[PDB]
Amino acid sequence: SGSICEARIDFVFPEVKFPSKKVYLAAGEELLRKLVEVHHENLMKSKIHYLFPTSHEQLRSLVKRSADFVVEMCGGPPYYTLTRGEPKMRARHFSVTIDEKAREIWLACYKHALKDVHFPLSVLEEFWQWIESFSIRMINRRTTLEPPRRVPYSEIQDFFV
Amino acid sequence: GSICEARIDFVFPEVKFPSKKVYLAAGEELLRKLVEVHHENLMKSKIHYLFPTSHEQLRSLVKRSADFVVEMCGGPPYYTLTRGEPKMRARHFSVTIDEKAREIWLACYKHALKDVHFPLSVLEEFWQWIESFSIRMINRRTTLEPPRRVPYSEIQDFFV
Numbered sequence: 001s002g003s004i005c006e007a008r009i010d011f012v013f014p015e016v017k018f019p020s021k022k023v024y025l026a027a028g029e030e031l032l033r034k035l036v037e038v039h040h041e042n043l044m045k046s047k048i049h050y051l052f053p054t055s056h057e058q059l060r061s062l063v064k065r066s067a068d069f070v071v072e073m074c075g076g077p078p079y080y081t082l083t084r085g086e087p088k089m090r091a092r093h094f095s096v097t098i099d100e101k102a103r104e105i106w107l108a109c110y111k112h113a114l115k116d117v118h119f120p121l122s123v124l125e126e127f128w129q130w131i132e133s134f135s136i137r138m139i140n141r142r143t144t145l146e147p148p149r150r151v152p153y154s155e156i157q158d159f160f161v
Numbered sequence: 162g163s164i165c166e167a168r169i170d171f172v173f174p175e176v177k178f179p180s181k182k183v184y185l186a187a188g189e190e191l192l193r194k195l196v197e198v199h200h201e202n203l204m205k206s207k208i209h210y211l212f213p214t215s216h217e218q219l220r221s222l223v224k225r226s227a228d229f230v231v232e233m234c235g236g237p238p239y240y241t242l243t244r245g246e247p248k249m250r251a252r253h254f255s256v257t258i259d260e261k262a263r264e265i266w267l268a269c270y271k272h273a274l275k276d277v278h279f280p281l282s283v284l285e286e287f288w289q290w291i292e293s294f295s296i297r298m299i300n301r302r303t304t305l306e307p308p309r310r311v312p313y314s315e316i317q318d319f320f321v
């Protein structure tokens with residue numbers, strides 16, 4: 001008698017490949033920490049700078065934890081899970097409004113950081129594909145029916161050369 | 162390296178739109194009264210801040226919202242003739258709506274339904290419609306848990 005709308009999904013959170021330990025091995029802990037540092041400097045120069053701390057202590061605390069996480073996830077020593085514990089990154093991000101644009105700007109900041117620290121080309125794709133896909137899971141505010149944009153490494157490789 | 166497999170957050174469940182029985186049972190006047198007191202409830206609720214405050218702007222909201230409800234229950238096409246295609250999730254992107262907001266919005270409708278003495282025969286039909294359709298308006302997630310289902314059977318005693 002009355003119309004029926006089928007069950008639906010908004011969008012799929014794609015599978016994410018975490019980087020192998022080769023990334024830690026080829027890049028080294030110090031480059032990885034420097035990567036995260038200039039990623040944050042780009043963020044404070046981006047349209048989403050307001051989501052981030054201004055007090056140099058809070059910021060240093062953030063960078064350190066992000067760097068610990070990145071180093072560990074790239075195959076390094078368990079700096080993060082031994083200090084902060086379980087990752088549960090989607091849940092930890094609920095307290096910050098993250099829409100599709102926010103993810104795209106965050107990615108852009110990482111892209112530039114990767115080039116500016118001269119991240120070794122041979123492990124660049126493995127790192128990129130991780131953050132590109134993983135970042136989709138942090139999105140907690142939707143503003144469009146369209147799915148979050150996929151940005152494959154092939155689309156951006158020329159930028160690194 | 163480790164791979165986390167693809168996943169969904171939650172499913173937008175099936176939604177059953179009301180049959181014309183709801184409009185024939187209630188009549189347009191009651192449906193407009195229902196929407197009016199749903200909005201009086203909203204203005205006293207903890208999501209009041211999401212809504213305009215002047216009589217002029219609320220009258221407008223209420224009129225549009227009621228036009229939609231009347232048409233969707235099987236009455237005249239007041240909404241499509243004026244506002245056009247529903248696209249309701251899309252229209253709500255402009256309001257920040259988390260899980261609690263949907264629950265509060267539903268609670269306001271639950272009380273309105275009772276206070277306007279909505280005809281008991283079509284009460285569940287109307288309820289199951291908004292209970293499910295409202296999940297599709299949520300655009301701000303604050304928990305990994307799925308949005309609460311509130312089936313008519315869990316609240317049917319509230320009405321009598």
Ligand code: HEM
Nearest residue numbers: 051052065066069084092095096098102103106134135138
């Ligand atoms: C998608 C867009 C993203 C935005 C806009 C964003 C922004 C933020 C903000 C504002 C914080 C502040 C800390 C807090 O919430 O208390 C934070 C924390 C953090 N973010 Fe993100 N983030 C994004 C994605 C990611 C991704 C993909 C990762 C994966 C490596 C990540 C890793 C972290 C870590 C490790 C912390 C610190 C957690 C802790 O203190 O234990 N973020 N992020």
Ligand code: HEM
Nearest residue numbers: 211212213222225226229244256258262263266294295298
């Ligand atoms: C789930 C929680 C919901 C919240 C918090 C919410 C809140 C709002 C707000 C703030 C507005 C705009 C107010 C204004 O323009 O002055 C609006 C408009 C409207 N809402 Fe909702 N809403 C919700 C769910 C729903 C549902 C389930 C329906 C289904 C009938 C609905 C139907 C409408 C209609 C028809 C409009 C008018 C759109 C237009 O201007 O054409 N809403 N809502």
